[PDB]
Amino acid sequence: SVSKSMKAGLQFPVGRITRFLKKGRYAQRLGGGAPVYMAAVLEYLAAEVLELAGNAARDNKKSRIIPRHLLLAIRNDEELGKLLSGVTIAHGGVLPNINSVLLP
């Protein structure tokens, strides 16, 4: 028995995502490669966000990712900020910015 994630070369649960897609009743039938495609996309997005968050944590001289680092990674990236513009991160704070007029 070779798991579908190992067959597709992924770390994400292709089988669990298949179960979630079937349970959600998004369509009458589900294609063979739709869960594989979804798992690949989710894995890529998680990898991107975690790469940016780990870089932010390293820049702060910390070895652990906290919600602040996730928010910094999200807000400092153009495309992730576009994707998650209307999203509030708990315990994330805000991006440090002060208008030029307010400076002395």
Binding site: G86, V87, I89, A90, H91
Partner: protein
């Protein structure tokens, strides 16, 4: 319960403005900011309570608040 809107003190509003990048604050802001805040809560809590009323429950859960926020384009991570 009455007058609890005044529990949102002037220093709290000033701290929220500081986190928002505000340097100087007018005197009448603290009143306006209160009313605005109240409106926001009334838009969310209502929806939340609606969910609580549909599940035949009497206790408002974090799921109800999260769904009520998502209904208004204010998705909130960390409580899911």
């Amino acid at each position: 319960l009455r007058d609890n809107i005044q529990g949102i003190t002037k220093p709290a509003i000033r701290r929220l403005a500081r986190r928002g990048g505000v340097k100087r604050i007018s005197g009448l802001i603290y009143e306006e900011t209160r009313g605005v805040l109240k409106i926001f809560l009334e838009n969310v809590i209502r929806d939340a309570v609606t969910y609580t009323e549909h599940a035949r429950r009497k206790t408002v859960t974090a799921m109800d608040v999260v769904y009520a926020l998502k209904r208004q384009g204010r998705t909130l991570y960390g409580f899911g």
